Design a binder for this molecule. Structure first.
Ligand SMILES: [Zn+2]
Ligand SMILES: [Zn+2]
Length: 474
């Protein structure tokens, strides 16, 4: 007998096909059958009339590396329907690095002495021993590797340093990492050359991993950063993933037409993917950057002046007699939300066929960007249902089947017999992001239940206690 059948709903199977009325039967960690399952014995027949049963959402872009260890419930993600998270993005991974005060933005993963894993395998073993509620597909970050190896980060790595970083990257991939990410936009890697990145990432071809990147620039010089990314992909001969695609700053509004045309052209000749979050504000370390600071900026946390969390930076700066750019050093280290994108570009990037959905949630932030709690339902409700940006099955595909294919997560991302039972039951009519910039941790509406490897992890608007997630390999 099946352990249970989710009966009477509409299955949106993750393959970008209109939903169909069908039941879903689960046995252990697998989807056993899909269709009219009235004739199949089951221990429970759960009524989901009026709901959609879809694959669990795969968050293509997270910074959950440490959150998986410290808050195993993973409530910000499972409450939105997420069943798998891709970690170690933008060059920032929790491991391998033993450091009491890692350089920003590595601090976005730190709760205080969290960087304690000398080897990447130590980190994966910790996840397997005390599993989180969601599956984890983990990358190693090039900035973490630089911090672990280089005594001076403000220059290109020497061949000896490249050798040491490449050995750590190869060990991480051998241990189960699914790829390597970079983020040369940030201080720890701003002096890394394209050739340094290529040499450190060479093992990806041998291990079958992916190259993910927070591009060197996402504003005035985004074309040069895109070209750098495509060149790295051709040299490595592995799939590239462009993280949180955007055009930032007023001088770049509207340029998503141009960047998407360059990405589409590259996709015809090499393997390229991209993801995005559904919002017009970004969030990361507080940084002296004229573009990030041009517009409205909110503080998410601040070490030297904790009371500034949640405050408007223009007010803080003006009261200190300075521009935002000039006041930043005295407030560091800190985090911020930056309103530097324009809605038409966000919509164009979300609608572009290949764009996968990634939350870019920063889970340790005191006053976080709402994308941490509302990304997936914002796409299914606000964008698909309310604005008609894409039909519901395409919105679901962009957070399930597409993502599983691009990251190589076998037997996940689709409601198919034999695949793993990572599933979401949601109400298409009411699914919605509740988190706002003012109340960024509100739980999404319309998420009935979430299952990971067949175990319910979210039910009755609460974590069930099931630590069902697994460390995944590509
Ligand atoms: Zn990131
Ligand atoms: Zn990034």
């Amino acid at each position: 007998p099946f352990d249970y059948i989710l009966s009477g709903g509409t299955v949106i199977d993750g393959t970008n096909a209109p939903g169909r009325l069908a039941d879903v039967g689960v046995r252990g960690d697998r989807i056993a059958a899909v269709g009219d399952l009235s004739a199949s014995s089951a221990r429970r027949r759960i009524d989901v009339a009026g709901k959609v049963v879809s694959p669990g959402f795969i968050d293509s872009h997270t910074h959950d590396d440490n959150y998986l260890l410290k808050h195993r419930d993973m409530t910000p993600k499972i409450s939105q329907g997420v069943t798998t998270v891709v970690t170690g993005n933008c060059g920032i991974s929790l491991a391998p690095l033993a450091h009491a005060n890692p350089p920003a933005p590595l601090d976005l993963l730190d709760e205080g002495g969290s960087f304690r894993f000398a080897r990447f395998s130590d980190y994966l073993e910790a996840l397997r021993a005390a599993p989180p509620a969601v599956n984890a597909a983990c990358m190693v970050g090039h900035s973490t590797l630089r911090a672990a190896v280089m005594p001076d980060l403000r220059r290109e790595a020497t061949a000896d340093e490249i050798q040491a970083m490449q050995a750590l990257a190869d060990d991480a991939l051998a241990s189960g990492a699914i790829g390597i990410s970079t983020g040369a936009f940030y201080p720890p890697a701003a002096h890394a050359s394209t050739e340094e990145i290529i040499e450190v990432c060479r093992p990806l071809i041998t291990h079958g991993g992916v190259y993910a990147t927070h591009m060197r620039d996402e504003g005035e010089h985004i074309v040069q950063a895109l070209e750098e990314t495509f060149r790295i992909g051709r040299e490595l001969d592995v799939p590239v993933v462009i993280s949180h695609h955007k055009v930032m700053g007023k001088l770049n509004f509207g340029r998503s037409k141009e960047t998407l045309a360059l990405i589409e052209a590259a996709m015809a000749s090499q393997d390229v993917s991209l993801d995005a979050y559904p919002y017009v504000a970004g969030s990361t370390m507080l940084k002296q950057d004229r573009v990030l600071l041009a517009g409205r900026t909110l503080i998410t946390w601040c070490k030297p002046y904790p009371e500034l969390s949640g405050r408007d930076l223009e007010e803080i700066a003006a009261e200190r007699g300075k521009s935002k750019y000039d006041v930043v050093p005295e407030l560091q280290p800190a985090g911020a939300i930056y309103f530097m994108m324009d809605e038409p570009d966000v919509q164009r990037i979300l609608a572009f066929g290949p764009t996968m959905i990634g939350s870019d949630g920063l889970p340790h932030d005191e006053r976080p960007h709402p994308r941490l709690w509302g990304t997936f339902p914002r796409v299914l409700g606000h964008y698909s249902r309310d604005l008609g940006l894409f039909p519901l099955e395409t919105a679901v595909w962009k957070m399930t089947g597409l993502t599983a294919a691009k990251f190589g997560l076998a037997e996940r991302g689709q409601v198919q017999p034999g695949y793993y039972a990572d599933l979401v039951v949601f109400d298409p009519a009411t699914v919605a992001d509740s988190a706002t910039f003012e109340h960024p941790t509100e739980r999404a509406a319309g998420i009935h239940s979430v299952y990971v490897n067949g175990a319910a992890v979210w039910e009755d608007q609460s974590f069930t206690g099931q630590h069902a997630g697994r460390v995944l390999n590509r």
